[PDB]
Design a protein around this nucleic acid. Sequence first.
RNA 1: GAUGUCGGCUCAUCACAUCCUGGGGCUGAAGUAGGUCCCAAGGGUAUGGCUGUUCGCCAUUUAAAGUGGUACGCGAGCUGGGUUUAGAACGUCGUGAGACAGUUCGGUCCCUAUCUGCCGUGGGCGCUGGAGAACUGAGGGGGGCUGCUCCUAGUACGAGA
RNA 2: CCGACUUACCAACCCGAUGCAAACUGCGAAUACCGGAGAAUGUUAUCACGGGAGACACACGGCGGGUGCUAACGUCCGUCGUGAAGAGGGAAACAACCCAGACCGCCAGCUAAGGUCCCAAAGUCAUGGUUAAGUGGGAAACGAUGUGGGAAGGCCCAGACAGCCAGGAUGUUGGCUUAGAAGCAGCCAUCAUUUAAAGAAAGCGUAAUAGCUCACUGGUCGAGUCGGCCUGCGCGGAAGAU
Lengths: 94, 71, 136, 141, 164, 38, 176
Amino acid sequence: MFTINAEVRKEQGKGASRRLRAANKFPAIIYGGKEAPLAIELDHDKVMNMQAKAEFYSEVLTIVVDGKEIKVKAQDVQRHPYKPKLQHIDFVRA
Amino acid sequence: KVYYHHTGHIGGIKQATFEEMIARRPERVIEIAVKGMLPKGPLGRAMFRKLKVYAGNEHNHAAQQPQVLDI
Amino acid sequence: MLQPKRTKFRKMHKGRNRGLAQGTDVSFGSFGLKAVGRGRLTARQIEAARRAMTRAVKRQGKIWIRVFPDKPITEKPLAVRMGKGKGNVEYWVALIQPGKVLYEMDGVPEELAREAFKLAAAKLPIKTTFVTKTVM
Amino acid sequence: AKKVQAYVKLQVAAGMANPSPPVGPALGQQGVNIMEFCKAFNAKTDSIEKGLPIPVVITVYADRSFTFVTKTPPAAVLLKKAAGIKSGSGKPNKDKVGKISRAQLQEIAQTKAADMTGADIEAMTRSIEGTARSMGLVVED
Amino acid sequence: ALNLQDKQAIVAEVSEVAKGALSAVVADSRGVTVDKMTELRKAGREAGVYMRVVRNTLLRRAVEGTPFECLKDAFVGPTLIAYSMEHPGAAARLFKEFAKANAKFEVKAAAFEGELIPASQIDRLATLPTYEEAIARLMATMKEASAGKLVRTLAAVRDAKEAA
Amino acid sequence: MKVRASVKKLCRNCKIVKRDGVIRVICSAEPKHKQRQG
Amino acid sequence: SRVAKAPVVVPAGVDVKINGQVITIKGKNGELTRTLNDAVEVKHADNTLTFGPRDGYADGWAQAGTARALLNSMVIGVTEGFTKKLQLVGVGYRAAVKGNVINLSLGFSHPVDHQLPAGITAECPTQTEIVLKGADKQVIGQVAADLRAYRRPEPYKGKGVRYADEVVRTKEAKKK
RNA sequence: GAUGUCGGCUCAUCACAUCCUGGGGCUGAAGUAGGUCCCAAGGGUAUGGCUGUUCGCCAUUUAAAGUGGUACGCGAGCUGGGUUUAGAACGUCGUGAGACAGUUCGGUCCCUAUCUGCCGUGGGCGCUGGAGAACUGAGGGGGGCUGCUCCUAGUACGAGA
RNA sequence: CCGACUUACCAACCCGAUGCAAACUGCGAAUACCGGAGAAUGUUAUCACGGGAGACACACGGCGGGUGCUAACGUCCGUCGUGAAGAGGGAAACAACCCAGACCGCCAGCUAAGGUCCCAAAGUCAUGGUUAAGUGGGAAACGAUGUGGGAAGGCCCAGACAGCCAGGAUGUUGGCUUAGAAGCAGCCAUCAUUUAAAGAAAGCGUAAUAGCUCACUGGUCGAGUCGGCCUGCGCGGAAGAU
């Protein structure tokens, strides 16, 4: 159970996602149903070491973006092919 | 860069040391700093022959009193 | 060597890649050893690494193995001129790809599994990373 | 290096401190003679029992002087005495070569109270309980 | 705390007893040389007196954040604290038992129920009191020192060996 | 001493010190664990 | 360094002269008793020394701890006098002082010609004990370093010259 | 349209991961000694025999008998010994011609140096009028190795030798 | 006599979870391709038949695979820049690399790859971080408290962190064993005690005993520190023939 941040974003392609990783930010997405999710940017490290324990994934999260708060828990994770740091993460609403 | 040369040895090669240069008048340290800054063979020699340095702060080879200069 | 009985066929093409040929994430446990580089293992190195982990952990925790030797590799010895056919089958090779996790654990405490992987990384040809999973 | 470390162990009788092999080799090396030790130890050991070993704990300076603290008879000798043994089991808690009463154990506790630090007359007893357990003596009522 | 609890634990531990304590004594002997250290532990369980060794930093933070017994600068450099919560006379008795193997000039000063008791006065306090003979001496000190003779009204148990 | 590279410790503490540009390992009370390289 | 961010107290009559990256300490000195620090500015006042910023070497606080150790050492130096106890382990080696010379040997008739400046003096109570006398902390240990540079303390019986931090284990003959 | 070999003799040369003295850590090194062991190009670094010989086998000197490279150093150095060198023919094999790195008998190896280097040597010119005489050191190499015993020293240490 | 109560263990088909494949397939791009119809451009790239071939012997390198060790200035095939079949700029230079395509003239300007202290044409640039090693400007395994920044985090002025000092304790030289047998030669006790602090001890060490490092306590002591992980700089690892 942690207090994390987001700015709202949507991208397409390798080049864009790499332009986030150029300044030590990366993307994420918020699903539920079968609809258009809430697409966000995250920080590399504000979600890796808070993630070094199972409480990130078992318990719900205060994620703040432009006065919106929605509640979410982590799902399966995408990792770099040369670093343990987070390339892309999934979330479900909780 | 301790400037090895052929001069005849056995077992190794004989050399000049960086260390020799200071003991046998102060010039040689200053001297292979400006030498190495000039071109090729012949031009680097035509340039070179215009430098004098000697023992330094004590040398008679200054009696002219030239144009004074700070750089 | 900790190698398979028969995969595919007995004599096979070497297996080059321009990027990823599978394996890049954690798949079991709460922690493991990630490669973060690429290259070959003759199965002898996998064994050597397994011994190191079994000498540190003992009975506390079971080991899940996340790699195996896939492709048989021929040698044509350094005693005869190259250009004419394909050599005897010599070793089975595991292809490690970039960020391929090799071994995972959960039974034993985190610091025993992490230390056990540092010993195992000296038996390996690259510099590696301890990788944490926690559940997924 | 300087010999400025840790309470050094010896446990010796008054007449068992004149030769070297019963004592171990170490005093010789730390600048203390077997003769000077022997004279200094009898001063506080023959005030009491001398036919059995009195525990002594030593500090040594970088100038080859010594200090030694000499005590009453060890609880460990008394537990041998009171139990009718001279030898223990060599595998305690798994083989038991005699027994000791608790009410007797407290009189042993009290004899070692000249140097014991325990806050109750039981606390002293509970320390020599594991001394009895080490020597193969069962602690029972 | 989760690296070392031992150092965080000791600040609460002086502060609890030293608010608590009818006499305490702040003295210098340093947290080395086991022989004197053992003997002040040893006799301390006999007389009913507890002893802690504590930095002057810990001691100044225990007076800053929490009430103390009025020895707010009587600690200097490496400092030990012996204290009694129930029997004030034992507190002074323990140094007279402990000088028989080291020294008595180790006390800088003492406190008794809020009053400063100096290092010359404690040698009088220490002469085999039970709690009532300590209390009695503190009233005999004040009565003398206060110039009015309304301050004296009982000696028949208040200045005896009887309850005081 | 020997040409042993890497400056991992040999006892529970060593003085770990970079002398003339090579890091030597050595103990605080012993000359045995002096190694020329690291 | 924690300790360059707290001042260091100086007694009466101790003159601590600030004129540059050299600071020079007098009181009742045998010699030139002095301190080198660069990365800090030390003002004297006259009762307490005050530590603040100046320029120096690229390592973090490179001289500011240095100034703390060295100032206090030299100040204790001129007042009471610094430590003096030098010694050697073993017999059959000499430790005989003659003037400003210390006669020591490996086994040989001739001296090893170990010599001291004007600034310091010695005498020896016994043929293993050396007393060096002075007021600057550095120089007394520089002749000690030279005395250990012909025979050292090395672990086989422990025999050698001993001074400051010691690096020897005092082993014996083998028996298995 | 030639970067061409073994073996012997001569003549070298450089890399130090030094055969050795020399300064020095360690040691399960007491000391002596050795193992472990780093700096070091400075210097001495052995020879006769049989055999075409590497490698071999053997006697030996000196305190001593090192490693590596060099068109597997050096036929625009030497001999031309070696492989059937080209030749029988023994041994061997095929019907034979012909072959064989098993073999025995003696047996064709070139260049006077263009430029280049290396060492010795003269002519001519700047040396500030000319002449003759001593001469400073900008510069650069050579001795450089290594046993014996007297003293050092029967001494520290070790159980004692 | 026939028959049988009776799994304690191994390691499979299988089963779940987990890993994988030119010659395996439940699933499957990007791009390439054609002809029409359209923009643009190419002094025909392509078509018939008649005259002349040459090349088929390619090479350091991009994209990718086989052969090879994911060795090699390696070898070959579909594909391509440059040389072949083209001057110039840059690289200590070159057959082949990178920019680039030599009409010819121009004491002209600009920009590329590559450069800017002198050599040598242009920045000892303005501002900040770090290495003590000519690393930079020579490579991997590999290790560590060599040095700094960063977010998350433990510790964190209530005293850290690391070391140096000093302590390493009460019963206790516990029992056996034994030159003695002590936390550390071996093995069993594996605890208790006053405590602020001291494991009947993590590591070394005449193997012990000794000597020694160790948290923790108290001095030095009052502010950063260290573990994971991203990152610039360092170290030894990194010894051969003018």
